[PDB]
Amino acid sequence: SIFTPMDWMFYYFPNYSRDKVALMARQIKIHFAIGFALVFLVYHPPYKGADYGNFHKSPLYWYKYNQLERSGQLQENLRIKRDWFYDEDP
Amino acid sequence: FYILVNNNKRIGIYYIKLSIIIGILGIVLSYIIRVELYNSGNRIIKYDNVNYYNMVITLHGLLMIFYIIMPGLYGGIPLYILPILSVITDIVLPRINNISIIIVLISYIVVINSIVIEYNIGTGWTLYPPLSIIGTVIVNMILYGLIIIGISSIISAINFMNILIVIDGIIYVYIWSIIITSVLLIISLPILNGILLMILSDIYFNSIYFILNGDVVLYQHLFWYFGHPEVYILILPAFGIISIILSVLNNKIIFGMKSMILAIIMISILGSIVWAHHIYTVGLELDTKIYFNNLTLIISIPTGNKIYNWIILYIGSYNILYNGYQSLIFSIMFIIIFIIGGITGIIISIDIIDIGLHDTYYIVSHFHYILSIGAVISLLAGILLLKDIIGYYNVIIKINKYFGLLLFININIIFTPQFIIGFNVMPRRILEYSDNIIVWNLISSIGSISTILILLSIF
Amino acid sequence: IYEGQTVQESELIPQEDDWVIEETNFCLGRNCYVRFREEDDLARRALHQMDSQLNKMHTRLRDGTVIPYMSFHPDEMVDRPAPIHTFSEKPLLKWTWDETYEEAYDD
Amino acid sequence: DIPWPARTDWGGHDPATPFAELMINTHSMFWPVAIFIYVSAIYMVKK
Amino acid sequence: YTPSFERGLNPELTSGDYGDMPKPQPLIDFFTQNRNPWFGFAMFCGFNFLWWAFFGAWQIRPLWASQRKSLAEADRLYGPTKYGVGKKYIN
Amino acid sequence: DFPWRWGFVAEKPFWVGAPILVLGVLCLGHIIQTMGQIGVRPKRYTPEWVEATKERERAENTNPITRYLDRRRAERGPYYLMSNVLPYHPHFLWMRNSHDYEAAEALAARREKDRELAAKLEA
Amino acid sequence: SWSVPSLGIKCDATPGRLVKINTFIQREGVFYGQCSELCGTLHAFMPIVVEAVSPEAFAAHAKKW
Amino acid sequence: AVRSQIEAAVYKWTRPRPPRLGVAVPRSPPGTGILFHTNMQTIRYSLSPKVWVLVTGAALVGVFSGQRFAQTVLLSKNPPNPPRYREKPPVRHPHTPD
Amino acid sequence: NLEDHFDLAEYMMKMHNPMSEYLYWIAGFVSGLHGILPLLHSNYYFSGMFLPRDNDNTQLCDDSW
Amino acid sequence: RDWLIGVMLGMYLGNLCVQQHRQYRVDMKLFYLEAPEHKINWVKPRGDL
Amino acid sequence: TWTEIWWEHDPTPKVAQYRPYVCTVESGKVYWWCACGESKTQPWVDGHCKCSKREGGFRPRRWEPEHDGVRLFCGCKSCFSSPTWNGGCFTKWMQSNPAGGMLYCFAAAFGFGTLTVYRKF
């Protein structure tokens, strides 16, 4: 089990956790596979994950985006505030 | 007799006595450094004699690690109480125990004799080639000491492992700490011996491993493969002592005994596969750096569990018991100090942060808080706890609140500024420095002279 | 985890209405450095040290039983300072179980 | 650029490259977490 | 220093005969430790170490007055221009 | 059962003796290390050399971000720098009247030549 | 070890390894550094000074030298 | 006057109910009074859960309310940066050989 | 025998000869000298002075002493 | 339960440094755009001594 | 609340004062502290309270200072560090008057927040 207090595992799944020695082995094996899978399935795969046009936009993104879009803040935020180096000296 | 004695308890005393004696030379070397770093410009070392300073830092590091702290925590206390904590009478291999302490002394005499007779040059305690293999004979002598010290460490590790066969009681947390430290020595020492032989081959047998077409980074891998387990070998016995002191002096059963034991085991396994965080700036592969950085952070998880288990040991203890005993204060001080050292270790584990903080005094302060304060205080705390059993006297340390307070304040003055200096930035292993770092270096120097004065008060 | 011994309600019923927890002092007394006599030679000072061992002390309860000095670890069970030979007789670690055999009993 | 007297410079100072800024921001990002770890533990060091 | 007798929130509970036992006192006495001059010297002391630990030794400033002034002039005359409140700081 | 030194110290309240000892030990440490440098007056800490460093910093625009950040912090609230109030070297005790007169003449000459070059550059 | 703290560079100069470091300097200035690997008697006496100037200034400087 | 009413209301609502023991213990025999004495090792006096929340909640409001007070009254906002004007750099580096 | 019960019986029973303690302290003192004496010897060998004068390797004012 | 106080105390003190970092990033974004401390065509090569 | 709702077999004191008693004490002298709150020579046993009469489980609490000075003594009779004061008197007061406790804790927290924020900012 992952991020699971084993006292809960003992209580709610007595038959499954009846053999504690076997249960300990599964704990090691399960987390061994996860670590192995992360390297070869999340990190390794080549030429993948570069579709930057498909950035995930969660509902919280749209809630804040629409709130600023409704007002002028979004337009004001995106506006370039300064595009010159020196100010004119009077 | 005095040299022929095989009694393990006597040998344990000899380890403590020898560490103090060698400690004086280590303290002298440490004092030479901070006096020189008081301000820019030479103070006690001539500009034409800068080679001596390199030897001072090299010996300061070597003596303190292999000749002072390791014998004190792994040879001194364990040889005294470990057979007592076990229900057995004496150590399993009595004759081996005798030769181990004698070996440590002979290696010390070889090292100090080399100072007097050989030309004084330095290459750091890590002995990085090619600098180590283009030096004079003092480097050859230092190698002989390390190899000789390695023999004593391994045979002592064999001695402790045999307790599992004869132990007639329960394996307490302290016993586990010593056993796992022995396991680390058994697996790490042979690797160290192999690479040290290669250093000798280049120095003395015309080998070409550390010249062009021979990767010098090869040494760093093999050395640090032993190097980092060594720091964990130093501290793990300290963890065992803290567990005993806190439980005994608070009359509280050790909470989560199995969690403590598994934490020690986990640290050793992780500590054996994270050595390359000492090699971030050499230009390792991207995936390699990510792996070591990720696994290095994981070491905090088991180390954190032990910290919290210690805290609950002190919480809720009876108020009527006097809490001003030096042993209790030192044990509590260790938790506060170790957290500082460990947290800074996690900061420098991030490799991009380490790019700026490698080879700076921030790293110095990191391992001083853990070793110079934490390990020493743990060794002091254990010796104080066993004062009645050991039976030493003629010192005022058992109930001395002035010594504890002054030591804590002044050691923090030495090494807190060194964190700040790290960002300024001041490199390590340096005698001169820019004028604008004087203020912080001056404050630490005042801290160093103050600490030495405090030691005279114990007598 | 350990949370003390289990207690049944019947075990808490007193045999008298005036029973209260016994007020026996478990402070062994006032101590300091062991103070030897100048007249005592090496042998007799050793006897003096052996007679000042806190781990040989106990507190006698009202029923005649004594609660001795106890420690979590056996390091506190040897004479202080530690003698050359400590555990001449192997310390016994007492385990408890519910198993029994008929030979031990008689009808 | 150069060290200056009695400066904490916690996390670094005076970046001149985008990578230099990254080093400082990374330390500042973790610094509050370090304080939380220390304060939470130390507050419970007591009887 | 013949401290006073503080009767407390409930005066009835301090109304008995104290004999030789000490009598309760105002809380200011605790902070002054009965005006022990050495607690006050050790007090003046406490503030000095604290000040050095967080702000540095400001007891050296009277001796550093002349050399600080020269440093201030050098920054203003030859150092990089400061703006606004930045002029208050000299390195 | 203790010598005079401990009997004297252990008699006093801990928080009376402790703060005095902390200050005393620190003061002794500073005094001990100051013994070996009485009257040492390096030229690089003289006013003339200090001014020259300021000239170099202005030309090199040294640490522009710290100066910017210091101004920003001060505008917002209370900002205190040790460098502002404390000496940066330990030889300040002896160098109240020390000067390097050779540097003063050279620096003045270079400043005069620079003024000529500036006028020529203005053209 | 070639260290320039302001540029965020600390790369070990190891025999047999030609390590590659990329940088992009944003502001002009002079950035000081020191060797960050113990290398012998004068490890403390081989500083690193890098001065960044405008591209037009650099082009003129490069041509002259 | 109002303080007394609110004080009484909070006092009544915060009186603790008997704890729901998370440990297996027997029932004390009926009619059993005081059996121990005051020389027993002191047991820390702990607030009841309701009181702890109210007191703890008040501190959280206090600390962050104080933070807002400082930021709005004691501290000040940055004024706009001074205008950047074209300045003349020094003619020569002070160490340029002559 | 009663005398042999305790390890280091003379010391533990507070009858030992003080010379043993003096030798231990002397041994520690000699160990410390291994850091100071070679410092003085090496300084003289390469400079002709046992110890430097502070900042003697840098430019000093005329009145410096 | 008391340990929660340490968590809340640590969170508050940690949040103080978050605010400082937050203001620091705002200041840095304005350095190259508006700060007069930022100068160009200023540093000239010293040349070999 | 151990005596109030958890355990009914320990003696329960009366609060003499929700503030500590300041007293000057001398090293080498033994003092006896009232654990019932009914003595009239607080914070010391007067010879007529429950502690003096050994009634209802109340006994005098022995105490001895290491050094001479002025020390704070528990008036609430429940401080963890009794006889000495450690702040339990305020804690026990908040249990009795939680509304007042909120006001003090808010005020103390407000001051701490302002000073810490003002200096760091």
Ligand SMILES: CCCCCCCCCCCCCCCCCC(=O)OC[C@H](COP(=O)([O-])OCC(O)COP(=O)([O-])OC[C@@H](COC(=O)CCCCCCCCCCCCCCCCC)OC(=O)CCCCCCCCCCCCCCCCC)OC(=O)CCCCCCCCCCCCCCCCC
């Ligand atoms: C096929 C080819 C054939 C070829 C054939 C060729 C043959 C060649 C042969 C080659 C072999 C030669 C050697 C053979 C050895 C035989 C052993 C044997 O059987 O002995 C029985 C024999 C029995 O003696 P006995 O005749 O019955 O009489 C004994 C007494 O009556 C009372 O009995 P006891 O045992 O109690 O008395 C002994 C003891 C009794 O005295 C004491 O113990 C004194 C009281 C203690 C005071 C406190 C000391 C400090 C605390 C130390 C704590 C750690 C101790 C560790 C254990 C001890 C280690 C030695 O005193 C000593 O022996 C000296 C003790 C030294 C302790 C050292 C502690 C550390 C010192 C740190 C120095 C720091 C400064 C640095 C600079 C200097 C560096 C050197 O053994 C001994 O007792 C004597 C041993 C003497 C030999 C020791 C050799 C040491 C060499 C060290 C290396 C030096 C090289 C570099 C030189 C540099 C100089 C500066």
Ligand SMILES: CCCCCCCCCCCCCCCCCC(=O)OC[C@H](COP(=O)([O-])OCC(O)COP(=O)([O-])OC[C@@H](COC(=O)CCCCCCCCCCCCCCCCC)OC(=O)CCCCCCCCCCCCCCCCC)OC(=O)CCCCCCCCCCCCCCCCC
């Ligand atoms: C596809 C491939 C499949 C392959 C399948 C292969 C199948 C192999 C089956 C193996 C079955 C083993 C059966 C024997 C079990 C052990 C029994 C035993 O030792 O009897 C005691 C026996 C003494 O007899 P006794 O009188 O019954 O002892 C009474 C007790 O002393 C009195 O104590 P007590 O009664 O209070 O407590 C009893 C017990 C108390 O202790 C226990 O009960 C411990 C129980 C757990 C042991 C570990 C089991 C494995 C756990 C799973 C690990 C899976 C990792 C997967 C990784 C996959 C990656 C791909 O005591 C002991 O066990 C004492 C011995 C402990 C030695 C530990 C040495 C360090 C090893 C690391 C510790 C284990 C960490 C596991 C991982 C932790 C993190 C999750 O011990 C000895 O004879 C001592 C000999 C000492 C020799 C030392 C020198 C050996 C050479 C060293 C070379 C370097 C080693 C490097 C190690 C690195 C470690 C990190």
Ligand SMILES: CCCCCCCCCCCCCCCCCC(=O)OC[C@H](COP(=O)([O-])OCC(O)COP(=O)([O-])OC[C@@H](COC(=O)CCCCCCCCCCCCCCCCC)OC(=O)CCCCCCCCCCCCCCCCC)OC(=O)CCCCCCCCCCCCCCCCC
């Ligand atoms: C910056 C000013 C510097 C002043 C100079 C330094 C003066 C010396 C101070 C020495 C203090 C020692 C205290 C005892 C050690 C602590 C152990 C402990 O806590 O356990 C006690 C006790 C445990 O039970 P126990 O068995 O009775 O004690 C065992 C002892 O360890 C057994 O140890 P023992 O055998 O050695 O016996 C010690 C015994 C006897 O202790 C003594 O003799 C100490 C008596 C108190 C003296 C305090 C003098 C303060 C003078 C302040 C001057 C301020 C102006 C400076 C100039 C500013 C210019 C801008 O202690 C007691 O009876 C415990 C009393 C409770 C602790 C009181 C600590 C706070 C005192 C008030 C500090 C006020 C600072 C204001 C700063 C304002 C700056 C502008 O209960 C506690 O743990 C107490 C909890 C904490 C209560 C106090 C809370 C802090 C005070 C309010 C805030 C103050 C800061 C405001 C800043 C505002 C800035 C704008």
Ligand SMILES: CCCCCCCCCCCCCCCCCC(=O)OC[C@H](COP(=O)([O-])OCC(O)COP(=O)([O-])OC[C@@H](COC(=O)CCCCCCCCCCCCCCCCC)OC(=O)CCCCCCCCCCCCCCCCC)OC(=O)CCCCCCCCCCCCCCCCC
């Ligand atoms: C880190 C520091 C801070 C630490 C703080 C924390 C500490 C916490 C506490 C730790 C406690 C740990 C456990 C302690 C257990 C103690 C058990 C015990 O006492 O065992 C009994 C044990 C022995 O007692 P025993 O049973 O009566 O033994 C009877 C003997 O076996 C038999 O009696 P005997 O009379 O027959 O004895 C034979 C005696 C025969 O005696 C004599 O004949 C003596 C004649 C007088 C000689 C005196 C020395 C002369 C020196 C002259 C120098 C001239 C220089 C000229 C310079 C000219 C320059 C121009 O000696 C010998 O024959 C052999 C001597 C060999 C060893 C001594 C070596 C000395 C150094 C040599 C250096 C060589 C350098 C060469 C370099 C060349 C390089 C090329 O005690 C000791 O050995 C003494 C231990 C003392 C310390 C006890 C612990 C106290 C607490 C710690 C205090 C602080 C210490 C700080 C370190 C030291 C700082 C300097």
Ligand SMILES: CCCCCCCCCCCCCCCCCC(=O)OC[C@H](COP(=O)([O-])OCC(O)COP(=O)([O-])OC[C@@H](COC(=O)CCCCCCCCCCCCCCCCC)OC(=O)CCCCCCCCCCCCCCCCC)OC(=O)CCCCCCCCCCCCCCCCC
């Ligand atoms: C109302 C007041 C203000 C409230 C604020 C609220 C804030 C939110 C928190 C949540 C709300 C809390 C509300 C609680 C309501 C009450 C609930 C309850 O049950 O009450 C009854 C309950 C128990 O009642 P009881 O059972 O009757 O017993 C009451 C007794 O009084 C016994 O009481 P106790 O045992 O609970 O005593 C607690 C004591 C217990 O503490 C200990 O025992 C500590 C022992 C170890 C001390 C270690 C000292 C430090 C070592 C440093 C190492 C280096 C040394 C260098 C030396 C150099 C040379 C000199 O805790 C402390 O002393 C606090 C330690 C906190 C961590 C310290 C480290 C701060 C580091 C911050 C980051 C630094 C970055 C630096 C950046 C650069 C510079 C700016 O009492 C409480 O809950 C009391 C809570 C009060 C805690 C106040 C702590 C304030 C500390 C402020 C630190 C500020 C740092 C500023 C710098 C920041 C830079 C970023």
Ligand code: HEA
């Ligand atoms: C006893 C000695 C000792 C100990 C225990 C440690 C422990 C650790 N060390 Fe240390 N280290 C040294 C001695 C030691 N080290 C020495 C001597 C060097 C320099 C060698 C040389 O270059 O010469 C060094 C160098 C060193 C480096 C830099 C190497 C280099 O590039 O030069 C790093 C980098 O990450 C590091 C990391 C760590 C970490 C992550 C731990 C961890 O074990 C710390 C874990 C502990 C904590 C984190 C605190 C406790 C936990 C908590 C409070 C809760 C959980 C916390 C978090 C999740 C953050 N060490």
Ligand code: HEA
């Ligand atoms: C155990 C190891 C240990 C210990 C205790 C110390 C203690 C001290 N060290 Fe350190 N030090 C190292 C290990 C240690 N050191 C290492 C490994 C390096 C890196 C080497 C290298 O650069 O290659 C180093 C580097 C190092 C440097 C950097 C040198 C340079 O790069 O130029 C400095 C500078 O001040 C320094 C100072 C100090 C000081 C002032 C003390 C102490 O004075 C601090 C306070 C301690 C005391 C006042 C003494 C207390 C008593 C004991 C420690 C002995 C106790 C004995 C028993 C209990 C038996 N140390």
Ligand code: CUA
């Ligand atoms: Cu090159 Cu150091």
Ligand SMILES: [O-][O-]
């Ligand atoms: O080594 O950490």
Ligand SMILES: [Cu+2]
């Ligand atoms: Cu490491």
Ligand SMILES: [K+]
């Ligand atoms: K120097």
Ligand SMILES: [Mg+2]
């Ligand atoms: Mg390096």
Ligand SMILES: [Zn+2]
């Ligand atoms: Zn009473």
Ligand SMILES: [Zn+2]
């Ligand atoms: Zn109270």
